[PDB]
Design a protein around this ligand. Structure first.
Ligand SMILES: [Mg+2]
Lengths: 224, 104, 224, 79, 49, 217
RNA sequence: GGAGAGGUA
């Protein structure tokens, strides 16, 4: 009585490439739901992600035109690009370059990747070149952000196209509380966080990030 | 009717949901018009005659005109009921707030 | 596509004019974001005038209510097609069946009054995924009347305005194709014969996608 | 700030001359160089006039007699 | 046939599932109805009014 | 970037000794609920506290009786006893004594208390005696617990009230700071039972949760 | 400025 068991991370099971499960144990009664809900809100709310912001195609002036050789318009290219998954190690703002010529799909794998930038899904499609001598060269801009940022509300030449940012690795978070079996005790819980990210964020890192943000923002109540 | 304004980062006039009955204003696309009273006597007249907290009884008859309309009423009706056998039936409490804490 | 239709979609889609319905079944020879070419089957070909069918697609052009209509291909290289089949989807169509809006996940329940009378509470995925944004096209005109005190012109120089607002006008006085104007800007610079320059209506944003100029006979045509 | 005018109406039981008396007081306060009798909390002149009326330290007749007194002194201010 | 098709998938045949509130994290009683509905955005914007 | 607004507790207002209203401003878009709700649960459910648990009436064999001299029934008496607020600094479980005779109210202030046992509200009426020569002595057993419990899950047994809080609520609304747009604000409102000042209770809850989730960071 | 058509509540 008047003393509480402290939680811990028991195992980070990686069920698939982008689907993960985290187990927290033990938890006193009445904390299962509290921590589950707090962590769900934090994780869905603010995780630092990376996303494409500006595109600069060679022979296009604005996104509403079309280019000869490609199948889709420029709008669909921007849309497909908006969902690109990529991680950057050190730099907070990087520039990738894509060059392609010849018939076929243009996967993300054709990006001239640098040493640090890493593409997570090298089979993601971008466009279909339908001519033996139709080429596309573009310069993608990737930034680091913390949520949603529409093109309108941010803050030069006529060659830049602006896409909307969606910096958020997590996509769906669920959780379950279930009784566990410590050496001997009743009403001792165990929390299971099921996570479905887009592949750009390591689970344990994400959960530690949520814990630290919550705690260091809760610090404003002690010694008020 | 008069009102005080509260600035909102949007593009639609927010309206308190109780006075919709008085306006007979569904929210399915109705448009409303805003005027401002300029002079001083106009401001005082608005405040002391037309501010919404002074028109509660309809002029047609004494009946109130800000009756909780259609959803709050459902909430209250679902709140004051009694299942013959629910969880925690028969105990005794030390006042309302104790019951509130128990339920939460 | 609508998840629950009444089977009467394809008829409305193809019996209107928007979709580009084939006329003689054959084999797609080369698709593109603007045009399509079909090598006609052997049977459906006239003895002489062999040729091969060719379709042109209307890209972004304003409708009568300012809603852009364009056509996208819905086939690929090597795909057989038959008479009366659909090739190019118009506005609000999907593989040749009418599709006006989007299908979304709905839950019936009161929620803190934010849907009091008939209002609707909309989650933020509906706007993050950008699945309701609609493109509008507006046409703005500017004429050079022939009035007293002589006529007036569209010279790029106008009085008492800083070069900042003129940065978007070329030397002639007409905005470049693709400039990203905003509320309260100058599209064409006209002069009071003795400042009647056209300006963007307040509140609207967007990009200029096409410029046209007509000149009465007997007037020399300026550079643009 | 004010939400109601009920008590003020109780002090001045007509709800019409209330408007005129409050307006005259606020006019003295805004363009005239007079000062409030109640502490101000970043409130506009109309609400301050209504609050003064509320406490009952200004009504129509006292306003008129004060005007008469100040005008008498003004007549005595030229000598 | 709607019931049969629902049961083809593992969904609850009654059509109503049990949700959970976002803020509190506690359960709604009275299982509610959730499904998929086709919606259109009519041509009466706010910025034209 | 990737750095969040720490607020400084904006206002604490004591409408009374045991009722407080504390407003915190500003907070990220959608943390007012997160923090206001974790504190809500951690306050209501689990916290150290000392409240009476068992009753031993000198002249009653069982809780289905009535005493010659009391104008109420036994169950109402133990109801009024449930709200008794006691703090014991030294020991966890205690048994305390009362014994009243003569017509007049029977207040907790008249109880036979010790140094460690402290009654918060001495004016806590318990019963009324209607006979000059009828007296009742009673033994009350008090423990240390973590919220509410029933008694059939564990002599004249009553339910427990191990907590210093009695009501918690909050709301969220937007507010303004130096030069900035679109955040939220929290307004906690609480009504303790006097066993501890509300601000101290909020501090206790915050430290409990913060030390709970340490091992993650 | 005036007519005609369509639309919303
Ligand atoms: Mg209506």
């Amino acid at each position: 009585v008047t003393e509480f068991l402290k939680p811990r991370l028991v195992d980070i099971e990686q069920v698939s490439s982008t689907h993960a499960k985290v187990t927290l144990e033990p938890l006193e009664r009445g904390f299962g739901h509290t921590l589950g809900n707090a962590l769900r809100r934090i994780l869905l709310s603010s995780m630092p992600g990376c996303a494409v912001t500006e595109v600069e195609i060679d022979g296009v002036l604005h996104e509403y035109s079309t280019k000869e050789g490609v199948q889709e318009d420029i709008l669909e290219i921007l849309l497909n690009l908006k969902g690109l998954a990529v991680r950057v190690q050190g730099k907070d703002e990087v520039i990738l370059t894509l060059n392609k010529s010849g018939i076929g799909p243009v996967t993300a794998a054709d990006i001239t990747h640098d040493g640090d930038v890493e593409i997570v899904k090298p089979q993601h499609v971008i466009c279909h070149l339908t001519d033996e001598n139709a080429s596309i060269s573009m310069r993608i801009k990737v930034q680091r952000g913390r949520g949603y940022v529409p093109a309108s509300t941010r803050i030069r030449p006529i060659g830049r196209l602006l896409v909307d940012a969606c910096y958020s690795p997590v996509e769906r978070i669920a959780y379950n509380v279930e009784a566990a079996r410590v050496e001997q005790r009743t009403d001792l819980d165990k929390l299971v966080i099921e996570m479905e990210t887009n592949g750009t964020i390591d689970p344990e890192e994400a959960i530690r990030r949520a814990a630290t943000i919550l705690a260091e923002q809760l610090e404003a109540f002690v010694d008020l | 009717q008069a009102f005080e304004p509260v600035l909102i980062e949007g593009k639609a006039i927010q309206l308190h949901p109780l006075v919709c009955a008085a306006y007979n204003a569904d929210f399915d696309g109705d448009q409303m018009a805003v005027h401002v009273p300029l002079t001083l006597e106009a401001q005082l007249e608005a405040r002391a005659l037309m501010m919404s907290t002074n028109n509660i009884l309809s002029p047609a008859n004494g009946e109130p005109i800000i009756v909780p309309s259609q959803d709050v009423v459902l909430g209250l009706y679902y709140m004051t009921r009694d299942c013959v056998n629910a969880k925690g039936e028969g105990m005794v409490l030390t006042g309302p707030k104790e019951a509130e804490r128990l339920y939460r | 596509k609508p998840l629950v239709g009444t089977g009467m979609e394809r008829a409305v889609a193809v019996d209107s004019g928007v979709t580009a319905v084939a006329k003689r079944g054959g084999v797609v020879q080369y698709v593109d974001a603007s045009r399509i070419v079909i090598k006609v089957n052997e049977d459906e070909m006239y003895p002489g005038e062999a040729g091969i069918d060719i379709y042109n697609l209307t890209k972004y052009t304003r409708s009568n209510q300012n809603t852009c209509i364009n056509q996208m291909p819905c086939v690929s290289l090597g795909e057989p097609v038959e008479r009366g089949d659909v090739l190019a989807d118009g506005p609000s169509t999907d593989l040749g069946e009418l599709a006006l809006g989007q299908n979304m996940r709905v839950a019936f329940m009161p929620w803190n009054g934010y849907n009091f009378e008939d209002s609707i509470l909309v989650s933020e995925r509906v706007v993050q995924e950008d699945r309701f944004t609609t493109i509008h096209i507006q046409e703005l005109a500017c004429v050079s009347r022939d009035t007293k005190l002589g006529p007036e012109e569209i010279t790029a120089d106008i009085p008492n305005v800083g070069e900042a607002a003129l940065s978007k006008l070329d030397e002639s006085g007409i905005v470049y194709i693709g400039a990203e104007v905003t509320g309260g800007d100058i599209l064409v610079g006209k002069v009071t014969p003795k400042d009647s320059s056209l300006r963007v209506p307040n509140g609207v944003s967007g990009t200029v996608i096409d410029v046209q100029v007509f000149t009465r006979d007997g007037v020399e045509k300026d550079k643009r | 700030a004010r939400v109601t005018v009920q008590d003020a109406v109780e002090k001045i039981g007509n709800r019409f001359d209330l408007v005129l008396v409050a307006a005259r007081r606020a006019r003295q306060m805004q363009v005239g160089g007079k000062d409030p009798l109640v502490p101000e909390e970043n409130d506009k002149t109309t609400v301050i006039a209504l609050r003064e009326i509320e406490e009952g330290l200004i009504n129509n007749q006292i306003l008129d007699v004060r005007e008469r007194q100040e005008q008498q002194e003004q007549e005595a201010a030229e000598l | 046939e709607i019931k049969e098709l629902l049961k083809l998938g593992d969904l609850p045949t009654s059509g109503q599932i049990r949700l959970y509130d976002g803020r509190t994290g506690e359960q709604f009683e009275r299982p509610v109805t959730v499904g998929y509905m086709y919606m259109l955005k009519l041509n009466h914007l706010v910025d034209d009014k």
